[PDB]
Amino acid sequence: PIVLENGKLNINIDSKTGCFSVTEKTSGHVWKSDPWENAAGLLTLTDSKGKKQTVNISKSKKIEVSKTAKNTVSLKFIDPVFEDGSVAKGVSIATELRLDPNNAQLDVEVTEHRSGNFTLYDLRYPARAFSLKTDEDKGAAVIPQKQGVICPSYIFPMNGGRFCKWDDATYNNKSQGSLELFNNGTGLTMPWWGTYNEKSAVMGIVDVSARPHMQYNINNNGQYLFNAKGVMSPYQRIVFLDPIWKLDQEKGKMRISYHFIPGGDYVDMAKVYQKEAKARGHFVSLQEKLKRNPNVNKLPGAIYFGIYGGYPHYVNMPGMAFTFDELKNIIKTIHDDLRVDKAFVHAWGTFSNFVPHNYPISEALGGPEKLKAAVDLAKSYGYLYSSYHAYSPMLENDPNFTTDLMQRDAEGKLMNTGSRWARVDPKFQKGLAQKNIEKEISYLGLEADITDITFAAYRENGKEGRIELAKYIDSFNLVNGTEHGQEQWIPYFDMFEGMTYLEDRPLSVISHPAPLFNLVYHEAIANFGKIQDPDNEVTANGDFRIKALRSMLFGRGTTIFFAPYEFEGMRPMIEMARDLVSPVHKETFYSELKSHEYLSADYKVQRSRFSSGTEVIANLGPVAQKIEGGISIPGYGYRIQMKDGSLKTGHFQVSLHMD
Amino acid sequence: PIVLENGKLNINIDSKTGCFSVTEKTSGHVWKSDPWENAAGLLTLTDSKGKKQTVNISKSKKIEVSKTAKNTVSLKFIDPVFEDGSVAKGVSIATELRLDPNNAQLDVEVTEHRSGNFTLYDLRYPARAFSLKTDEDKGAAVIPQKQGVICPSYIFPMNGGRFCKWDDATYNNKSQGSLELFNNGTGLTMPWWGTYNEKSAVMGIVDVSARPHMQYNINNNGQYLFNAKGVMSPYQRIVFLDPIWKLDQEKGKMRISYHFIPGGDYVDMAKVYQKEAKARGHFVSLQEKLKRNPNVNKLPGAIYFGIYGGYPHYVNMPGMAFTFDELKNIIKTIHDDLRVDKAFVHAWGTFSNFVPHNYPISEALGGPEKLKAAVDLAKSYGYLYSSYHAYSPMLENDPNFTTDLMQRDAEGKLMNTGSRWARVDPKFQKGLAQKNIEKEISYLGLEADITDITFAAYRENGKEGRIELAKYIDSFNLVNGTEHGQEQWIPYFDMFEGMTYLEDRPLSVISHPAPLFNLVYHEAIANFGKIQDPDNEVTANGDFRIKALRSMLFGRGTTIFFAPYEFEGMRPMIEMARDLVSPVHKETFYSELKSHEYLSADYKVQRSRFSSGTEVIANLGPVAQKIEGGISIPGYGYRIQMKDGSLKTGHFQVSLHMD
Ligand SMILES: [Cl-]
Ligand SMILES: [Cl-]
């Protein structure tokens, strides 16, 4: 082998294949190259007939590996070979491995690619690296899918229904696939991922300029590679996560930085990234935000209430719209009867035109003075208030619909024809906001704003116009929120509505929620439940029992999101959130989520520690379980140590009243 | 126009296009032909270049429409034209429309197709027929997707989060697609579907010999057709369901029979089908089953308990496997402490080999005598008992794994390499069951059996071997169940585990559960909740509150499916099922589900009436709502009128106990 080495790592590079292993010297843990095919990389490209095929670059006609500097090895893979034995002449991939001279940190970069008369598409590089061996390694893959998850590398006790679905998925196509960076769908919210066992951890951080996808393989033995051939896989069940470099699209630097952490797990990974997040400029603390705007302290302990009037979808829809008097009375009841001390009231349906014309205040719902009376009541209670706003939609049912503000592609065709909520080109969105937002703020005396859609993702197309809008909104210095968010938007907002979990998502049945994003960013952005999956709805992500406990563990706020006709049914949930979640949310709001742990074999009992001095232990399953010191946590129960040393213990119960 | 007419229907057939309208003469409602393109049919076929294209068959070069009998119109569509104006010379499609002389029934059949030098694939015929106009018709599409759903043709009040998902799905690809018949995944469990408004209903029943797919379009304006062109749809939002004849594979008769019901809805449609089910031989009543086997009377009021010991997935898995003494104690606790009077105990993990070798009784778990003691205990209480059995798997982790009993295709390649649970060719399965099942029956004195996997679907490949196993099992005259089921298997079993709902399914955000299967088959086959989504798990399909109420409305039994370590956490739910669900299940078990109705604008308050003289009203949402007479049904509440005149009223409560 060729060798790169420092005080912490030894990298062994195979001259013949370009594959590498990483020995973490302190533990003797060796991270292995591809256990299945000894493939350094997997490259998808067209053949001479123009059919896409995926090849092992380690089978190329020529492979050149050399040390080109003390801590750099240069590799070159020349003329890959197709399945049928023909050669992709003139195709080459060049890469570098660069060891930090001091730290346990390896940079891996794809530095050039040549396509000849072929077309190159995906490159998995390194391929099937940093794997865990299922049922040998006791650890997990770590994936910042929205708030984040882990995927254990072994089978463990769990509810029998869940166990069937989990195990089964590890033998079919549910456990393999890919995810993308910085969307509000199924994708990742931070540019890293990793694997750990009981000895060591590795993560990879993707260069800021690049947008690889991430391939996963969760305990799968690769049977998916053999089904079309009708044979059984000869490979072993493993866990891996690989970068997919999109060679046909990517113009950035195709670099991933691997960090090796002895005895580390997902918390340690998160903290490594937190330092990078700060270097990248995303980290603007809620303490800095509170210094700029004292009204940010209306957020700790506040329930986020969304009163959904059928808008933006419809204007004054019968059986859904609220009047402004009705809004006022919901506000009053929240404060006077349900004793809610702090709240963020978000009223969906206050305008008589469709977004993106967020005006005038609707005469049919009572007019301006009647809305002002609602808002003033809220402000009298120290609640925050915002209308629903959006500057990105262009809706088919809007009488003012036009394609004039939609974007066109290089061929002159309309973009986002199938995505109605994100049709207005961002380059127009600041101008739309400017039409009325300052009038609303002046007329209502607003202290807060929430703006939908535009900041839910961080794609390249249109980003300049989105930044312009973000800066415009931020210039008002209101306590402000937006739908979902991404790390890149943290500087401009105080809270994100969402950054939790989709209901139906890849990896659902073979992962556990982990507060990855909040382990990084809790001190910098507040988050609340998503409006589609609020704390009052029973979904794949739980009922109120589960959601309330998870809120405290993860450091998010309560979301009660309702049509007006449901309000009386919200009362119990509001009370329970007020009693249990709100004081914990208050105490921990500005703090760091220092650590999170799973404390039971089924992963349902967890412990979170916040730099406020607050410790939350909760049991998200139905059966009491013991942890350390033989302490028992009831099903759907909690034990919380507050800053002041007091202890709160308790549990939820579901009962049946029979008359 | 050519007309077919009787006293109930007028069929108006356009002689230039082949499109037809149907006037239902009692209500006067007119079902229109394709509102979008005036297409009589949509045919997918390869072009001169071999690229598949879809074409409107009404644009064919020659269309021949003639009245060939009093009540038959014959159509021929000759030389379809491609996008580019080129012709598919030698291609033709012939159809017939046959009006029943007396009844409001129309048979539609594709009687011939010729391909010439082209290859034909899908044919939608009739295309976009029997549609509902969104927000003008107040009705629904009716789809027997597993237990069944309806898809309303208008927007209505509901929870705000649900509303956003619902409306949004009508404008993207979530509201269009296709489903297949007789699978245990996303598909249909009865060969019919339909549409209704406030005046009239139509359904179509597919010929017994055919396997069309079904296309859906739920309030979608056809934007999916235009996204690639980057233009806005010019079509209106409508609801339709079309048959998709797979011309490349279908050997049966491509006939659908349309039945027209003035004032009808999904209940009337289910009852039309019920007549056809009986004609097809699927309907063997529970009453007949009870006459054959008096032990069937151990099912009414019984909780289905699955004790999941990590088998079949693993043998004797630490932390999941139960011993036979442990199983005995669980059974004892359920009866003596939790006062469950009737139950079906299903123990997953009683053998020391992997399925499909369902023997011997495991020595490691205690041996035959200790299993007998647990079974005898169960029998002394009157409970039904089965071990887990399966004759279809061939598992990678089984030391005895071989490919010898796997099916191979015409190229000699293994089939089902991707489906571990369904690998043994059905032709072998009877033999595998024969190896030990009679030894088990005799040793344990079994009164019952549940067999997993084999009867979850009704596919053509392997059907004969499945039938042979069903008949073999049924020859024992045991109270018996199977996973999921299908209508074709009703004659052989007393119960099905499942026939409810997938958690993640197409149409989930744009449909309501409706008890379609049970509206047809409740008197013939009992069902219970699916082990993956049991009444103790909180999922997309609800928590215990919601599941228990739906169980009573739809006429299914309770499923408690748990790993042994969870048992103590099951107690409250077992109690509540005992007190609430079990007596209603007991009373209604053999009865007809006569009617189901949605009584609230949000579809959450419902009413079912059983021929036992039992009426169940329940509210599956959080807020109290009023029905007729101003009677209020509490959130998560019920009002049940029993045959004995008694009225049961009550509701679930979730409380927080702070110590
Ligand atoms: Cl969360
Ligand atoms: Cl159900």
Numbering used by the authors:
A (entry chain B), B (entry chain A): 35 to 693
Paper passage:
Carrageenans, alongside agars, are the main cell wall polysaccharides of red macroalgae and play vital roles in the development and physiology of these photosynthetic eukaryotes. In marine ecosystems carrageenans constitute a huge biomass and thus a precious carbon source for marine heterotrophic bacteria (MHB). The marine Bacteroidetes Zobellia galactanivorans DsijT, originally isolated from a healthy red macroalga, is a bacterial model for the bioconversion of algal polysaccharides. Here we describe in Z. galactanivorans the discovery and the integrative characterization of the complete pathway for utilization of the kappa family carrageenans (containing 3,6-anhydro-d-galactose units, mainly kappa-, iota- and beta-carrageenans), which is carried out by a complex regulon including a dedicated atypical PUL, lacking the susCD-like pair, and carrageenan-induced loner genes including distal susCD-like pairs.
Thus, these enzymes are exo-lytic α-1,3-(3,6-anhydro)-d-galactosidases which cleave the α-1,3 linkage between D-AnG and d-galactose on the non-reducing end, releasing D-AnG and odd-DP (degree of polymerization) oligocarrageenans. ZGAL_3152 forms a homodimer and the monomer has a complex architecture with an N-terminal distorted beta-sandwich domain (Pro35-Asp299), a central TIM barrel (Tyr300-Lys620) and a C-terminal immunoglobulin-like domain (Glu621-Asp693). The dimeric interface is mainly formed by the interaction of long loops from the TIM-barrel (342–357 and 430–459) with the two helices protruding from the N-terminal domain (η3 and α2) of the other monomer. The dimer is also stabilized by the swapping of the C-terminal strand β36. There are two predicted active sites at either side of the base of an impressive crevasse that is 60 Å long and 40 Å deep. Numerous trials for obtaining the structure of ZGAL_3152 complexes were performed, but they were unsuccessful; however, buffer molecules found in the active site of each ZGAL_3152 monomer likely mimic monosaccharide units. In chain C, a Tris, an MDP and a second Tris are bound in the potential subsites −1, +1, and +2, respectively. The residues interacting with these buffer molecules (Cys198, Lys208, Asn218, His347, Trp455, Leu536, and Gln566) are well conserved in ZGAL_3152 homologs, suggesting their implication in substrate recognition. Three are located in one monomer from the homodimer (Asp486, Glu517, and Glu531), while Asp202 originates from helix α2 of the second monomer. Asp202, Asp486, and Glu517 are strictly conserved. Site-directed mutagenesis of the four candidates yielded soluble inactive enzymes; these residues are thus involved in the catalytic machinery, although the structure of a substrate-enzyme complex would be needed to determine their respective roles.
